[PDB]
Amino acid sequence: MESHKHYTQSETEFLLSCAETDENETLDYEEFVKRFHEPAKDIGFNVAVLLTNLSEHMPNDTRLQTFLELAESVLNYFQPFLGRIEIMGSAKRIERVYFEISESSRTQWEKPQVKESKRQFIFDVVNEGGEKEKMELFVNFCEDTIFEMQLAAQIFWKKIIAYQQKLLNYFARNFYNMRMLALFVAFAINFILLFYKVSVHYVLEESSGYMEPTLRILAILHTIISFFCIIGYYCLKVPLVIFKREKEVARKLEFDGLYITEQPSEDDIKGQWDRLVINTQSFPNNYWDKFVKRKVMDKYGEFYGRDRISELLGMDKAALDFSDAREKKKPKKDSSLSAVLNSIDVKYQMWKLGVVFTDNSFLYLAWYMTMSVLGHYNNFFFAAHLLDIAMGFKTLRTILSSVTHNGKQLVLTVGLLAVVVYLYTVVAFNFFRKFYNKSEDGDTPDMKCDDMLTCYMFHMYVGVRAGGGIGDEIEDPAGDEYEIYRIIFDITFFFFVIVILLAIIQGLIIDAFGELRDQQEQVKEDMETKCFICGIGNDYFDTVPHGFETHTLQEHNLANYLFFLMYLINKDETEHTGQESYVWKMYQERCWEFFPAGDCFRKQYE
Amino acid sequence: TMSVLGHYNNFFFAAHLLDIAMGFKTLRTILSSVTHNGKQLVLTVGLLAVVVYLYTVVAFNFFRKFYNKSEDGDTPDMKCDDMLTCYMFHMYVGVRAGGGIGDEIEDPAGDEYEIYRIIFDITFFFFVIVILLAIIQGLIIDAFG
Ligand SMILES: Nc1ncnc2c1ncn2[C@@H]1O[C@H](COP(=O)(O)OP(=O)(O)OP(=O)(O)O)[C@@H](O)[C@H]1O
Ligand SMILES: Cn1c(=O)c2c(ncn2C)n(C)c1=O
Ligand SMILES: [Ca+2]
Ligand SMILES: [Zn+2]
């Protein structure tokens, strides 16, 4: 470490003196650091935050600057672990609070699925909903995100259970890369299928060989990879959605009191389905609070007789159970039988299956599995997997969303086109039947206007697609009996059906695509030019160099707020400081005005 | 290099006529716009190729007999016999045709696949001609604007 050159000679000899004396001219740096650094870090973190607080609160203090320059090392070391939050409601002034952030929490935040959830949440909150419920949406996002990062950190019978759990965790971890592998193998199998020729038999031996065996291998490999993808999704993202649904129904029971006072409406099929889980054994399987049943019963039983409530929630009397446990805790343990019969709650499993099947992404994966099975039945069905690139890429997803964004108006315009084509059809059928002859030879004429159904189907199929209209696909009206009438007919058809209605139909989708692109660009611009927490203008921080960068990095940071919530949850309630306890009580009462939505620390003082 | 190749064959001097694009600002703007949205343009072209491939496999499986280009009663020129030929034909002809793929194939008078073939042609015209090609054109026009 003299070659390392981290200290001066005095510090080197001090470290030698404090070094473990092996009495054999040796030292064990592992045990040395384990003994010294950890208490040093845990105790000096408070010193570092004290110096940081003094520096931020006390400007233009030369002595304090000397202390900071002497303590540069500790501040630099603890800079990643130091988190800063601004709170408005504290004494009606903006106040800065400092806390500790774990490197494990930072890594879990950097996990890819957490980042994907973050970007989806930001898009949802910025594009729609405004800022009226922005704080509530942010708090819900924080709860779901900390649950997601806890799940990620989590990611002979005992041996096999451990092995299968490890396999499931591996699939959950490698869900995305295996998804890309599935896309690549789908592209390869489609490339192989491209060399197909009819002989009724669909012979693929266009080349010398080595195509059918590898095609079969790629098909079975694709099916296996798709099954593994669905397993990984089930063990990765299903817990998050079921946790969200359980939280929603539990909060409805607590605050709204849905299944207690007034039953959900019949149109609320989601509420009707959720009625099934409010009475099973493990209702809050993923929700952190397992006492929601006791809370709702203590809330409403004294008014509703406690008996209907006890029956509808199960478990009988929560108050009686709590009293019995408090008087004497159950001094026994239930042995885990190997061949235990129906240990799981069948009703809860049915509810979970219902919600995961109503989920959209799981439906897409089920469709992928079905397409793979149909591809095994007939190899040609693998072409449907080529549309996964639309999900993969954002622009293609934007086009697929735009094709349905204006669905109602598009359907109405198509209906109007059908109606006007029908009117032209009946006019032609009544007056211009003889002109619709497609027989090029003097053989039996092919009148398309003899029958109304045929005439209308012909009009819709041909006139709309034709650039010139209907007049370009029928005999010219040389006869003077209907010359001008037929010409006006054709011109009106061309004007109203070709260059107006079809133009509007095209413009609806093109404008939907443009509007979606503009919305995404506007979300990005807002994120770049305003602060999520407070909303102060970008220029005010730009008054100083990189002022907005600093404000969004350390002053108001979404990760910092999430880590502060995690810190409050992890800390013991008795150990909470004044500001921490106030914020915790506010979060419990669901008020959410501690966020400095109005002002900032700088506008408060400097 | 173009001048040297022009000495090798005088006809290579035609490539120098593109220097006006560098010379004038508006022409340079068009040449920059043709690549400003390059990533999205490539993605849209890929989506067009994918959808044309899907229509190709559908036609190959069900509507092979309609793709006859033999005007005389001589040996039929089936363009749908081979998948590679059918897909290349679709990409080359259906995209360029204003009416879609139904205007370059035999009309489905037979009742066995009348409605199926008509829906096929209408969907091809709607999704490939008046949507995807429109988006591809609009990308470059909007980049120029
Ligand atoms: N907590 C915040 N408050 C206010 N503005 C913020 C906050 N976090 C980020 N921003 C702003 O959002 C801009 C876009 O960066 P953002 O932090 O949203 O994405 P990123 O983390 O860099 O990207 P990615 O998720 O792709 O890795 C930043 O330049 C910053 O101005
Ligand atoms: C009170 N509380 C929470 O509020 C919480 C939590 N996990 C997430 N959240 C939001 N846990 C475990 C918890 O005890
Ligand atoms: Ca205390
Ligand atoms: Zn801010």
Side-chain angles (χ1 to χ4, degrees), chain A residues 27-93:
Chain A
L27 72 164
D28 300 5
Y29 62 96
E30 294 78 350
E31 177 283 325
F32 186 82
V33 51
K34 183 183 306 180
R35 196 216 293 294
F36 286 95
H37 168 80
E38 279 76 351
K41 178 175 49 185
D42 308 350
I43 277 73
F45 183 78
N46 304 76
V47 182
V49 308
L50 175 55
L51 299 176
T52 301
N53 182 14
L54 286 165
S55 173
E56 298 190 4
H57 280 48
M58 271 305 208
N60 317 326
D61 254 29
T62 167
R63 34 201 182 160
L64 184 52
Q65 308 304 327
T66 67
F67 289 115
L68 296 174
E69 75 200 4
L70 298 166
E72 171 70 3
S73 172
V74 281
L75 299 175
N76 298 355
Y77 175 82
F78 290 114
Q79 179 286 333
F81 313 103
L82 178 52
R84 311 171 189 179
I85 300 299
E86 297 188 7
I87 296 300
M88 160 40 91
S90 96
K92 298 305 300 175
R93 301 183 314 272

Coordinates of all heavy atoms in Angstrom, one line a residue, chain A residues 27-93:
Chain A
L27 N -0.3 -10.4 8.5 CA -1.6 -9.8 8.9 C -2.7 -10.3 7.9 O -2.4 -10.5 6.8 CB -1.6 -8.3 9.0 CG -1.5 -7.5 7.7 CD1 -1.9 -6.0 7.9 CD2 -0.1 -7.6 7.0
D28 N -3.9 -10.4 8.5 CA -5.1 -10.9 7.7 C -6.0 -9.7 7.4 O -6.7 -9.3 8.3 CB -5.8 -12.0 8.4 CG -4.9 -13.2 8.6 OD1 -3.7 -13.1 8.3 OD2 -5.4 -14.2 9.1
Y29 N -5.8 -9.1 6.2 CA -6.6 -7.9 5.9 C -8.1 -8.1 5.9 O -8.8 -7.2 6.2 CB -6.1 -7.3 4.6 CG -6.4 -8.2 3.4 CD1 -7.5 -8.0 2.6 CD2 -5.5 -9.1 3.0 CE1 -7.8 -8.8 1.5 CE2 -5.7 -9.9 1.8 CZ -6.9 -9.7 1.1 OH -7.1 -10.5 0.0
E30 N -8.5 -9.3 5.6 CA -9.9 -9.7 5.6 C -10.5 -9.4 6.9 O -11.5 -8.6 7.1 CB -10.2 -11.1 5.2 CG -9.8 -11.5 3.7 CD -8.3 -11.6 3.5 OE1 -7.5 -11.3 4.4 OE2 -7.9 -12.2 2.5
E31 N -10.0 -10.1 7.9 CA -10.5 -9.9 9.3 C -10.2 -8.5 9.8 O -11.0 -7.9 10.5 CB -9.9 -11.0 10.2 CG -10.3 -10.9 11.7 CD -9.5 -9.8 12.4 OE1 -8.3 -9.5 12.1 OE2 -10.1 -9.1 13.3
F32 N -9.1 -7.9 9.3 CA -8.8 -6.5 9.8 C -9.9 -5.6 9.3 O -10.4 -4.8 10.1 CB -7.4 -6.2 9.2 CG -6.9 -4.8 9.7 CD1 -6.3 -4.7 10.9 CD2 -7.1 -3.7 8.9 CE1 -5.8 -3.5 11.3 CE2 -6.6 -2.5 9.3 CZ -6.0 -2.4 10.6
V33 N -10.2 -5.6 8.0 CA -11.3 -4.7 7.5 C -12.6 -5.0 8.1 O -13.4 -4.1 8.5 CB -11.3 -4.6 6.0 CG1 -11.4 -6.0 5.4 CG2 -12.5 -3.8 5.5
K34 N -12.9 -6.3 8.2 CA -14.2 -6.7 8.9 C -14.3 -6.2 10.3 O -15.4 -5.8 10.7 CB -14.4 -8.2 8.8 CG -15.7 -8.7 9.4 CD -15.7 -10.2 9.4 CE -15.4 -10.8 8.0 NZ -15.5 -12.3 8.0
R35 N -13.2 -6.1 11.0 CA -13.2 -5.5 12.4 C -13.3 -4.0 12.4 O -14.1 -3.5 13.2 CB -12.0 -6.0 13.1 CG -12.1 -5.8 14.6 CD -10.7 -5.3 15.2 NE -9.7 -6.4 15.1 CZ -9.7 -7.5 15.8 NH1 -10.7 -7.8 16.6 NH2 -8.7 -8.4 15.6
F36 N -12.6 -3.3 11.5 CA -12.5 -1.9 11.6 C -13.4 -1.1 10.7 O -14.1 -0.2 11.2 CB -11.0 -1.5 11.3 CG -10.1 -1.8 12.5 CD1 -9.4 -3.0 12.4 CD2 -9.9 -1.0 13.5 CE1 -8.5 -3.3 13.4 CE2 -9.1 -1.3 14.6 CZ -8.3 -2.5 14.5
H37 N -13.5 -1.4 9.5 CA -14.2 -0.5 8.5 C -15.7 -0.5 8.8 O -16.3 0.6 8.8 CB -14.0 -1.0 7.1 CG -14.9 -0.4 6.1 ND1 -14.7 0.9 5.6 CD2 -16.1 -0.8 5.5 CE1 -15.7 1.2 4.7 NE2 -16.5 0.2 4.7
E38 N -16.4 -1.6 9.1 CA -17.8 -1.6 9.3 C -18.3 -0.7 10.5 O -19.1 0.2 10.2 CB -18.3 -3.0 9.5 CG -18.5 -3.8 8.2 CD -17.2 -4.3 7.6 OE1 -16.1 -3.9 8.1 OE2 -17.2 -5.1 6.6
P39 N -17.7 -0.8 11.7 CA -18.1 0.2 12.7 C -17.7 1.6 12.3 O -18.5 2.5 12.6 CB -17.3 -0.3 14.0 CG -16.2 -1.1 13.5 CD -16.8 -1.8 12.2
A40 N -16.6 1.8 11.6 CA -16.2 3.1 11.2 C -17.2 3.7 10.2 O -17.6 4.8 10.4 CB -14.8 3.0 10.5
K41 N -17.7 2.9 9.3 CA -18.7 3.4 8.3 C -20.0 3.7 9.1 O -20.6 4.8 8.9 CB -18.9 2.3 7.2 CG -20.0 2.7 6.2 CD -20.1 1.7 5.1 CE -20.2 0.3 5.7 NZ -20.1 -0.8 4.6
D42 N -20.5 2.7 9.9 CA -21.8 2.9 10.5 C -21.8 4.1 11.5 O -22.9 4.7 11.6 CB -22.2 1.6 11.3 CG -22.1 0.4 10.4 OD1 -21.9 0.5 9.2 OD2 -22.2 -0.7 11.0
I43 N -20.7 4.4 12.1 CA -20.7 5.6 13.0 C -20.4 6.9 12.3 O -21.0 7.9 12.6 CB -19.7 5.3 14.2 CG1 -20.4 4.4 15.2 CG2 -19.2 6.6 14.8 CD1 -20.6 3.0 14.9
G44 N -19.5 6.8 11.3 CA -19.2 8.1 10.6 C -20.2 8.5 9.6 O -20.1 9.6 9.1
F45 N -21.2 7.7 9.2 CA -22.2 8.1 8.4 C -23.0 9.3 9.0 O -23.3 10.3 8.3 CB -23.2 7.0 8.0 CG -24.3 7.4 7.1 CD1 -24.0 7.5 5.7 CD2 -25.6 7.7 7.6 CE1 -25.0 7.9 4.9 CE2 -26.5 8.1 6.7 CZ -26.3 8.2 5.3
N46 N -23.3 9.2 10.3 CA -24.0 10.3 11.0 C -23.1 11.5 11.0 O -23.7 12.6 10.9 CB -24.4 9.8 12.4 CG -25.2 8.6 12.4 OD1 -24.7 7.5 12.2 ND2 -26.5 8.7 12.6
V47 N -21.8 11.4 11.2 CA -20.9 12.5 11.1 C -21.0 13.2 9.8 O -21.0 14.4 9.6 CB -19.5 12.1 11.5 CG1 -18.6 13.4 11.5 CG2 -19.5 11.5 12.9
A48 N -21.0 12.4 8.7 CA -21.0 12.9 7.4 C -22.3 13.6 7.1 O -22.3 14.7 6.5 CB -20.8 11.8 6.3
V49 N -23.4 13.1 7.5 CA -24.7 13.8 7.3 C -24.8 15.0 8.1 O -25.4 16.0 7.7 CB -25.9 12.8 7.5 CG1 -25.7 11.5 6.7 CG2 -26.1 12.5 9.0
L50 N -24.2 15.0 9.3 CA -24.2 16.2 10.2 C -23.4 17.3 9.5 O -23.8 18.5 9.4 CB -23.6 15.9 11.5 CG -23.4 17.1 12.5 CD1 -24.7 17.9 12.6 CD2 -22.8 16.7 13.8
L51 N -22.2 17.0 8.9 CA -21.4 18.0 8.2 C -22.1 18.5 7.0 O -22.1 19.7 6.7 CB -20.1 17.4 7.9 CG -19.2 17.0 9.1 CD1 -17.9 16.4 8.6 CD2 -18.9 18.2 10.0
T52 N -22.8 17.6 6.3 CA -23.5 18.0 5.1 C -24.7 18.9 5.4 O -24.9 20.0 4.8 CB -24.1 16.8 4.3 OG1 -23.0 15.9 4.0 CG2 -24.9 17.2 3.1
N53 N -25.4 18.6 6.5 CA -26.5 19.5 6.9 C -26.0 20.9 7.4 O -26.6 21.9 7.0 CB -27.2 18.8 8.1 CG -28.4 19.7 8.6 OD1 -28.9 20.6 7.9 ND2 -28.9 19.3 9.8
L54 N -24.9 20.9 8.1 CA -24.3 22.2 8.5 C -23.8 23.0 7.3 O -24.0 24.2 7.2 CB -23.1 21.9 9.5 CG -23.5 21.5 10.9 CD1 -22.3 21.0 11.6 CD2 -24.1 22.7 11.6
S55 N -23.2 22.3 6.3 CA -22.8 23.0 5.1 C -23.9 23.6 4.3 O -23.9 24.7 3.9 CB -22.0 22.1 4.2 OG -21.6 22.7 3.0
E56 N -25.0 22.8 4.1 CA -26.1 23.3 3.4 C -26.9 24.4 4.1 O -27.3 25.4 3.4 CB -27.1 22.1 3.0 CG -26.4 21.1 2.2 CD -27.4 20.1 1.7 OE1 -28.6 20.3 1.9 OE2 -27.0 19.1 1.0
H57 N -27.0 24.3 5.4 CA -27.7 25.3 6.1 C -26.9 26.6 6.4 O -27.4 27.6 6.7 CB -28.2 24.8 7.5 CG -29.5 24.0 7.3 ND1 -29.7 23.0 6.4 CD2 -30.7 24.0 8.0 CE1 -30.9 22.5 6.5 NE2 -31.5 23.1 7.5
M58 N -25.5 26.4 6.4 CA -24.6 27.5 6.7 C -23.7 27.9 5.6 O -22.6 27.3 5.5 CB -23.8 27.1 8.0 CG -24.5 27.5 9.2 SD -24.9 29.2 9.3 CE -24.9 29.5 11.0
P59 N -24.1 28.8 4.7 CA -23.2 29.3 3.7 C -22.3 30.5 4.2 O -22.6 31.1 5.2 CB -24.2 29.8 2.6 CG -25.4 30.3 3.4 CD -25.4 29.5 4.7
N60 N -21.3 30.7 3.4 CA -20.4 31.8 3.7 C -19.7 31.7 5.1 O -19.7 32.7 5.9 CB -21.1 33.2 3.5 CG -21.9 33.2 2.3 OD1 -21.6 32.6 1.3 ND2 -23.0 33.9 2.3
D61 N -19.2 30.5 5.4 CA -18.6 30.3 6.7 C -17.2 29.6 6.4 O -17.1 28.4 6.1 CB -19.4 29.3 7.6 CG -20.1 30.1 8.7 OD1 -20.4 31.3 8.6 OD2 -20.3 29.5 9.8
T62 N -16.2 30.5 6.5 CA -14.8 30.0 6.1 C -14.4 28.8 7.0 O -13.7 27.9 6.5 CB -13.8 31.2 6.1 OG1 -12.5 30.6 6.1 CG2 -14.0 32.0 7.4
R63 N -14.7 28.9 8.3 CA -14.3 27.8 9.2 C -15.0 26.5 8.8 O -14.4 25.5 8.8 CB -14.6 28.2 10.6 CG -15.9 29.1 10.7 CD -15.9 29.8 12.1 NE -17.1 30.6 12.2 CZ -17.5 31.1 13.4 NH1 -16.9 30.8 14.5 NH2 -18.7 31.8 13.4
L64 N -16.3 26.6 8.4 CA -17.0 25.4 8.0 C -16.4 24.9 6.7 O -16.4 23.7 6.5 CB -18.5 25.8 7.8 CG -19.4 24.6 7.4 CD1 -19.2 23.4 8.4 CD2 -20.8 25.1 7.4
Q65 N -16.0 25.8 5.8 CA -15.3 25.3 4.6 C -14.0 24.6 4.9 O -13.7 23.6 4.3 CB -15.0 26.5 3.7 CG -16.2 27.4 3.4 CD -17.4 26.6 2.8 OE1 -17.2 25.6 2.0 NE2 -18.6 27.0 3.1
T66 N -13.3 25.1 5.9 CA -12.1 24.3 6.4 C -12.4 23.0 6.9 O -11.7 22.0 6.6 CB -11.3 25.1 7.4 OG1 -12.1 25.2 8.6 CG2 -11.0 26.5 6.9
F67 N -13.5 22.9 7.7 CA -13.9 21.6 8.2 C -14.3 20.7 7.0 O -14.0 19.5 7.0 CB -15.1 21.7 9.2 CG -14.7 22.3 10.5 CD1 -15.2 23.5 10.9 CD2 -13.9 21.6 11.3 CE1 -14.8 24.0 12.1 CE2 -13.5 22.1 12.6 CZ -14.0 23.3 13.0
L68 N -15.0 21.2 6.0 CA -15.4 20.4 4.9 C -14.2 19.9 4.1 O -14.1 18.7 3.7 CB -16.3 21.2 4.0 CG -17.7 21.6 4.5 CD1 -18.4 22.5 3.6 CD2 -18.5 20.4 4.9
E69 N -13.2 20.8 3.9 CA -12.0 20.4 3.1 C -11.2 19.4 3.9 O -10.5 18.5 3.3 CB -11.2 21.6 2.7 CG -10.4 22.2 3.8 CD -10.0 23.7 3.5 OE1 -10.4 24.2 2.5 OE2 -9.3 24.2 4.3
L70 N -11.2 19.4 5.2 CA -10.6 18.4 6.0 C -11.3 17.1 5.9 O -10.7 16.0 5.9 CB -10.4 18.8 7.5 CG -9.5 20.0 7.7 CD1 -9.7 20.6 9.1 CD2 -8.0 19.7 7.4
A71 N -12.7 17.2 5.9 CA -13.5 16.0 5.8 C -14.0 15.7 4.4 O -15.1 15.1 4.2 CB -14.7 16.2 6.7
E72 N -13.2 16.0 3.4 CA -13.5 15.7 2.0 C -13.7 14.2 1.8 O -14.6 13.8 1.0 CB -12.5 16.3 1.1 CG -12.6 15.8 -0.4 CD -13.8 16.4 -1.1 OE1 -14.6 17.3 -0.5 OE2 -14.1 16.1 -2.3
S73 N -12.8 13.4 2.4 CA -12.8 12.0 2.2 C -14.1 11.3 2.6 O -14.7 10.5 1.8 CB -11.6 11.3 2.9 OG -11.7 9.9 2.8
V74 N -14.6 11.6 3.8 CA -15.8 11.0 4.3 C -17.0 11.4 3.4 O -17.9 10.6 3.1 CB -16.1 11.3 5.8 CG1 -15.2 10.4 6.7 CG2 -15.8 12.8 6.1
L75 N -17.1 12.7 3.1 CA -18.2 13.2 2.3 C -18.2 12.5 0.9 O -19.3 12.1 0.4 CB -18.1 14.7 2.1 CG -18.2 15.5 3.4 CD1 -18.0 16.9 3.2 CD2 -19.5 15.2 4.1
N76 N -17.1 12.3 0.3 CA -17.0 11.6 -1.0 C -17.4 10.2 -0.9 O -18.1 9.6 -1.7 CB -15.6 11.8 -1.6 CG -15.2 13.2 -1.9 OD1 -16.0 14.1 -1.7 ND2 -14.0 13.4 -2.3
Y77 N -16.9 9.5 0.2 CA -17.3 8.1 0.4 C -18.7 7.9 0.6 O -19.3 7.0 0.1 CB -16.4 7.5 1.5 CG -16.8 6.1 1.9 CD1 -16.3 5.0 1.1 CD2 -17.7 5.8 2.9 CE1 -16.6 3.7 1.4 CE2 -18.0 4.5 3.2 CZ -17.5 3.5 2.4 OH -17.8 2.2 2.7
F78 N -19.4 8.8 1.4 CA -20.8 8.6 1.8 C -21.7 9.4 0.9 O -22.9 9.3 1.1 CB -21.0 9.1 3.2 CG -20.4 8.2 4.3 CD1 -19.4 8.7 5.1 CD2 -20.9 7.0 4.5 CE1 -18.8 7.9 6.0 CE2 -20.3 6.2 5.5 CZ -19.3 6.6 6.2
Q79 N -21.2 10.0 -0.2 CA -22.1 10.7 -1.1 C -23.1 9.7 -1.8 O -24.3 10.0 -1.9 CB -21.3 11.4 -2.2 CG -22.0 12.1 -3.3 CD -22.6 11.2 -4.4 OE1 -22.1 10.1 -4.6 NE2 -23.7 11.7 -5.0
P80 N -22.7 8.5 -2.3 CA -23.7 7.6 -2.8 C -24.8 7.1 -1.8 O -25.9 6.9 -2.1 CB -22.9 6.4 -3.4 CG -21.6 6.5 -2.6 CD -21.4 7.9 -2.4
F81 N -24.4 7.0 -0.5 CA -25.3 6.5 0.5 C -26.1 7.6 1.1 O -27.1 7.2 1.8 CB -24.5 5.8 1.6 CG -23.5 4.8 1.1 CD1 -22.1 5.2 1.1 CD2 -23.8 3.6 0.7 CE1 -21.2 4.3 0.7 CE2 -22.9 2.7 0.2 CZ -21.5 3.0 0.2
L82 N -25.9 8.8 0.8 CA -26.6 9.9 1.4 C -27.8 10.3 0.5 O -27.5 10.7 -0.7 CB -25.7 11.1 1.7 CG -26.4 12.4 2.3 CD1 -27.2 12.0 3.5 CD2 -25.3 13.4 2.6
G83 N -29.0 10.3 1.0 CA -30.2 10.7 0.2 C -30.8 11.9 0.8 O -30.8 12.0 2.1
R84 N -31.3 12.8 0.0 CA -31.8 14.1 0.4 C -33.3 14.2 -0.1 O -33.5 14.0 -1.3 CB -31.0 15.2 -0.1 CG -29.5 15.0 0.2 CD -28.6 16.1 -0.6 NE -27.2 15.8 -0.5 CZ -26.3 16.5 -1.0 NH1 -26.5 17.6 -1.7 NH2 -25.0 16.1 -0.9
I85 N -34.2 14.7 0.8 CA -35.6 14.9 0.4 C -36.0 16.3 0.9 O -35.5 16.7 1.9 CB -36.4 13.8 1.1 CG1 -36.0 12.4 0.6 CG2 -37.9 14.0 0.8 CD1 -36.2 12.3 -0.9
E86 N -36.9 16.9 0.2 CA -37.4 18.2 0.6 C -38.9 18.0 1.0 O -39.7 17.3 0.3 CB -37.3 19.2 -0.5 CG -35.9 19.5 -0.9 CD -35.8 20.7 -1.9 OE1 -36.8 21.3 -2.1 OE2 -34.7 21.0 -2.3
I87 N -39.2 18.5 2.2 CA -40.6 18.4 2.7 C -41.2 19.8 3.0 O -40.5 20.6 3.5 CB -40.5 17.6 4.1 CG1 -40.0 16.2 3.8 CG2 -41.9 17.6 4.7 CD1 -40.9 15.4 2.9
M88 N -42.4 19.9 2.5 CA -43.1 21.2 2.6 C -43.8 21.4 3.9 O -43.5 22.4 4.7 CB -44.1 21.4 1.5 CG -45.2 22.4 1.6 SD -44.8 24.0 2.4 CE -44.3 25.0 1.0
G89 N -44.6 20.4 4.3 CA -45.5 20.6 5.4 C -44.8 20.7 6.8 O -45.5 21.1 7.8
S90 N -43.5 20.4 6.9 CA -42.8 20.6 8.1 C -42.7 22.0 8.5 O -42.0 22.8 7.9 CB -41.4 20.0 8.0 OG -40.5 21.0 7.7
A91 N -43.5 22.4 9.5 CA -43.6 23.8 10.0 C -43.9 24.8 9.0 O -43.4 26.0 9.0 CB -42.2 24.1 10.7
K92 N -44.6 24.4 7.9 CA -45.0 25.3 6.8 C -43.9 25.9 6.1 O -44.0 27.0 5.5 CB -46.0 26.4 7.3 CG -47.3 25.9 8.0 CD -48.0 25.0 7.0 CE -48.4 25.7 5.7 NZ -49.0 24.8 4.7
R93 N -42.7 25.2 6.1 CA -41.5 25.7 5.4 C -40.9 24.5 4.8 O -41.0 23.4 5.3 CB -40.6 26.5 6.3 CG -41.1 27.7 6.9 CD -40.1 28.4 7.7 NE -39.3 27.5 8.6 CZ -39.6 27.1 9.8 NH1 -40.7 27.5 10.4 NH2 -38.8 26.2 10.4

